[PDB]
Amino acid sequence: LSKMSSLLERLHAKFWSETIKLVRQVMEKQHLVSCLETLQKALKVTSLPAMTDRLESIARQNGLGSHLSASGTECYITSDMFYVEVHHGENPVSCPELVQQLREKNFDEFSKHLKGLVNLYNLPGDNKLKTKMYLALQSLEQDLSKMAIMYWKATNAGPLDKILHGSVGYLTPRSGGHLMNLKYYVSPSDLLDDIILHENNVSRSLGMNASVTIEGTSAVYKLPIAPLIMGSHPVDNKWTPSFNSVDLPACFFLKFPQPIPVSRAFVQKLQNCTGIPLFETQPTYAPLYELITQFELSKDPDPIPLNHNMRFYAALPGQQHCYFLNKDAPLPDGRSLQGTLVSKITFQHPGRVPLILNLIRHQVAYNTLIGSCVKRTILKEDSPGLLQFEVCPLSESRFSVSFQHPVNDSLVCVVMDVQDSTHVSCKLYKGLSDALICTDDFIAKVVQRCMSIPVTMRAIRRKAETI
Amino acid sequence: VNLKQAILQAWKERWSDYQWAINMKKFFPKGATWDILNLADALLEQAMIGPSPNPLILSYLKYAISSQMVSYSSVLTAISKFDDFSRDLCVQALLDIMDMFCDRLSCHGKAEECIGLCRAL
Amino acid sequence: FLPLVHNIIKCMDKDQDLNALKSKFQEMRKLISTMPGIHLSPEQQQQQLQSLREQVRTKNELLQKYKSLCMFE
Amino acid sequence: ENQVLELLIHRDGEFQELMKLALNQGKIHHEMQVLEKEVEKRDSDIQ
């Protein structure tokens, strides 16, 4: 709260023109003591020799065997991260995958990918798994690219029904400035270019995408050490039979960002494809929708308190509205909704997993899209509208929406089950004496394609209402 | 006619579910004609509901069968034509509440109301 | 200056007179900066320059208006 | 690593501002000399 240590007392407590004899008479003698040399990025711009010197300093401090002829160029001591832009395993690679993103002045993919792969490819193995198994898993991670190309060739209609939704196939190359990924999110009703307008496949970098990783500690499962199955399969794809197979100390542990709530049936079905289930811990069987809505809307949420308390009031096409969530409500099913509040994504070798992941992905996507209507709208005591509805998840992926239909003097529910991955069932149940306020399969498929609770509410209030 | 806006107001909000008795007594003449009570509300709500358990209403049903017109409840859960639909989810709760209803005993009606309730059961 | 601090660190942790050269360069830079001429802050200098430009424009317009309307005999 | 960094950033900003102020003062002095010469010529002609 003062500035008396800059020019008033700084130069007076430094213990001129002829008092610079401190280079040879008083010289008889980078983390938290010497910040001058550590702040090379602030004194000078990020250049070739500056980064090469910083890398060498970090290697000498933390401990990493690496050197060169002189200062001005430095490689990366790893399995295959050795690449000099502009031999103990693989040869010197100069592919564009690690030259495009870091061409001229990039400074992001220089201390995260390297450190990431170093932390991942680190274990108690001494020259037996730190390098051998790492290279084996890196080489084995190439059949998916051939499988991706085969899926792209087979699905020559559009990259919307096979790449993102339905099944896997929206993959990209995992090298340098881009790691392995997949189409986890499948939000089709986002802000599009007004089925994205692209020349070729997306590298899962333009916008938002998940992050798939390959690491493990005790999941030493039998897997190949080289790509064998590479021929074009009959219709969609073919498996790769291994076992030339050793106990490779690695796995396919991805990075699940949010604890998406799933069903017990999906986890039980997936618990028979890759050994054990997708999580080994105490299952947090708490209200699934309650925590899932907060986890999903937590991105946009600001530091201001919300305090919804199971209130799902939201807006409308031209007014305000309201809704519920039926959270923490034990249905006739008996036990409450199973919760999967965990971040363990420790998978196993790519065995019979052609649909072991896509089903749970579609389930989680439908669950998210259900609570999509409540993201940041906070408006209570709305006398007008207030199309309150309670999604009753009695069965797995089975929702219901109640609306004050003018047909009868009561609410109007409709069974909303996710039959397909994007074509959900939107049937409805009317009354013995009720007007035809129930739309046809046209509006049902429209709402299915929309997959938004607020969209359905607006449709009921505008199209189905007709009043 | 007041029953329509009454049940609309009831379902429209998640009240304390016990203040419902007070709200009904206030909004209703408290003894005009109890033949337009919750007795038919359950069925007229579950009709449009169909494959839905309609929660938050069974509590009202219980707070009614505590001390209300047991005869009307009996005849209306009897004439309920749910066997054709056979939801096996709502009729389950119906038989559950009917079990505890018929377990202990019926009540006095000072008339052939008992015989009517017997025909109903 | 980044180069001055770099030369100082080099001369300090190398085991020449980088400090003398740095001081000479700093004195030369200070002399070149003071060579401009503007002793006071450039805020009032720019304010006075804008005022003088406005006054010159007004004087030119007045002279033009005076030398234009010449219809007497 | 905050005080020294802030001091260096402030010194760089002060140097850039001083260079900009010197350039602006030179330009203003040139414009003022031109305007003064023009006004002196106009005043001599008017006199």
Swiss-Prot record, chain A:
Superkingdom of origin organism: Eukaryota
Interaction with the Mediator complex and THRA: annotated span: 1-467
Entry comment describing in which tissues the protein is expressed: Ubiquitously expressed.
Interaction with ESR1 as annotated region, ranges: 4-467
PTM: Phosphorylated by MAPK1 or MAPK3 during G2/M phase which may enhance protein stability and promote entry into the nucleolus. Phosphorylation increases its interaction with PSIP1.
Localization, UniProt: Nucleus
Chain residue ranges for the region called Interaction with the Mediator complex: 82-172, 175-339
Subunit structure, as described in the record: Component of the Mediator complex, which is composed of MED1, MED4, MED6, MED7, MED8, MED9, MED10, MED11, MED12, MED13, MED13L, MED14, MED15, MED16, MED17, MED18, MED19, MED20, MED21, MED22, MED23, MED24, MED25, MED26, MED27, MED29, MED30, MED31, CCNC, CDK8 and CDC2L6/CDK11. The MED12, MED13, CCNC and CDK8 subunits form a distinct module termed the CDK8 module. Mediator containing the CDK8 module is less active than Mediator lacking this module in supporting transcriptional activation.
Family as reported in the entry's similarity comment: Belongs to the Mediator complex subunit 1 family.
Name this protein carries in UniProt: Mediator of RNA polymerase II transcription subunit 1
Source organism: Homo sapiens (Human)
Shown stretch of the complete protein: 13 to 518 of 1581
UniProtKB/Swiss-Prot annotation, chain B:
Family to which the UniProt record says this protein belongs: Belongs to the Mediator complex subunit 24 family.
Organism field: Homo sapiens (Human)
Subunit structure: Component of the Mediator complex, which is composed of MED1, MED4, MED6, MED7, MED8, MED9, MED10, MED11, MED12, MED13, MED13L, MED14, MED15, MED16, MED17, MED18, MED19, MED20, MED21, MED22, MED23, MED24, MED25, MED26, MED27, MED29, MED30, MED31, CCNC, CDK8 and CDC2L6/CDK11. The MED12, MED13, CCNC and CDK8 subunits form a distinct module termed the CDK8 module. Mediator containing the CDK8 module is less active than Mediator lacking this module in supporting transcriptional activation.
Domain of life: Eukaryota
Location in the cell: Nucleus
Function: Component of the Mediator complex, a coactivator involved in the regulated transcription of nearly all RNA polymerase II-dependent genes. Mediator functions as a bridge to convey information from gene-specific regulatory proteins to the basal RNA polymerase II transcription machinery. Mediator is recruited to promoters by direct interactions with regulatory proteins and serves as a scaffold for the assembly of a functional preinitiation complex with RNA polymerase II and the general transcription factors.
Tissues and organs where the protein is expressed, per its UniProt entry: Ubiquitous. Abundant in skeletal muscle, heart and placenta.
Protein known as: Mediator of RNA polymerase II transcription subunit 24
Swiss-Prot record, chain C:
Subcellular location: Nucleus
One cellular component term from this protein's GO annotations in UniProt: core mediator complex
Keywords: Acetylation, Activator, Coiled coil, Nucleus, Phosphoprotein, Transcription, Transcription regulation
Modified residues (Phosphoserine): S41
GO BP terms in the entry: positive regulation of transcription elongation by RNA polymerase II; positive regulation of transcription initiation by RNA polymerase II; RNA polymerase II preinitiation complex assembly
Disulfide pairings: none
Coiled coil: 43-70
GO terms for MF: transcription coregulator activity
Similarity section: Belongs to the Mediator complex subunit 9 family.
Role according to the record: Component of the Mediator complex, a coactivator involved in the regulated transcription of nearly all RNA polymerase II-dependent genes. Mediator functions as a bridge to convey information from gene-specific regulatory proteins to the basal RNA polymerase II transcription machinery. Mediator is recruited to promoters by direct interactions with regulatory proteins and serves as a scaffold for the assembly of a functional preinitiation complex with RNA polymerase II and the general transcription factors.
Protein name in the entry: Mediator of RNA polymerase II transcription subunit 9
Organism this protein belongs to: Homo sapiens (Human)
Included stretch of the parent chain: 65 to 142 of 146
Swiss-Prot record, chain D:
Top-rank lineage group of the source organism: Eukaryota
Compartments (UniProt record): Nucleus
Record's function text: Component of the Mediator complex, a coactivator involved in the regulated transcription of nearly all RNA polymerase II-dependent genes. Mediator functions as a bridge to convey information from gene-specific regulatory proteins to the basal RNA polymerase II transcription machinery. Mediator is recruited to promoters by direct interactions with regulatory proteins and serves as a scaffold for the assembly of a functional preinitiation complex with RNA polymerase II and the general transcription factors.
Record's subunit section: Component of the Mediator complex, which is composed of MED1, MED4, MED6, MED7, MED8, MED9, MED10, MED11, MED12, MED13, MED13L, MED14, MED15, MED16, MED17, MED18, MED19, MED20, MED21, MED22, MED23, MED24, MED25, MED26, MED27, MED29, MED30, MED31, CCNC, CDK8 and CDC2L6/CDK11. The MED12, MED13, CCNC and CDK8 subunits form a distinct module termed the CDK8 module. Mediator containing the CDK8 module is less active than Mediator lacking this module in supporting transcriptional activation.
Family: Belongs to the Mediator complex subunit 4 family.
The protein's name in its UniProt record: Mediator of RNA polymerase II transcription subunit 4
Gene name of the encoded protein: MED4
Range of the intact protein held here: 62 to 108 of 270
